[PDB]
């Protein structure tokens, strides 16, 4: 999925 500070 997306990272922890992704979007």
């Amino acid at each position, epitope marked *: *999925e*997306l*990272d*922890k*500070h*992704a979007s």
Partner: antibody
Amino acid sequence: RITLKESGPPLVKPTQTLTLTCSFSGFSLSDFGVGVGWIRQPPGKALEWLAIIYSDDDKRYSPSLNTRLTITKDTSKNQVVLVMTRVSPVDTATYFCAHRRGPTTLFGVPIARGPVNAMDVWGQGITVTISS
Amino acid sequence: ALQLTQSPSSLSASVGDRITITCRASQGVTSALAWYRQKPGSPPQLLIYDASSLESGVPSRFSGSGSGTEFTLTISTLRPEDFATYYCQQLHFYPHTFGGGTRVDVRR
């Protein structure tokens, strides 16, 4: 100055459980958005990402190793522990822990996330051999 | 999962050359990409974070550009300590993948 160092057994037998400890100084795992991750490198091979844990205690694992890994932190001792169960010979590798910056803050307000995009400081690495 | 392919896998060069290593991702990773240099027997060392920012204390001959699916690291004037293996790392999606590495060795 941030420094990290890995410790644990240099030798481990197949089916056994491997516990690796990352002891660090220069930052606290209670600092905002900080992370500590683990990466391994079998001899002669590429780096392989294993897991990471953040100060707010969110944990993430490599999907290929998810069932055998547990990562945990001990904030007051400045340590991060990674436990790998049921090791086999292919797990022989040099294991590194590393620091990941949290976003830059201004008067305690997050203003820059670019610094989280890298693992900026690494430990020397600890060589682990899996053989019976 | 997400694939990170480095090119070339191996590269020969001489002191003073300009080299550029490239890393391509199977899906866009925005600017969440880092480059590292790893010398034999040592841990990887951060050169460039967030695709193009120069890490503090890292020499200016190192440069990184690109975003999305294509990134490049260029060393403008190769020094002896640069004969090593370079890796790119994506941090947009879990797991935080590493490329296969590119070995830079003395040309002859």
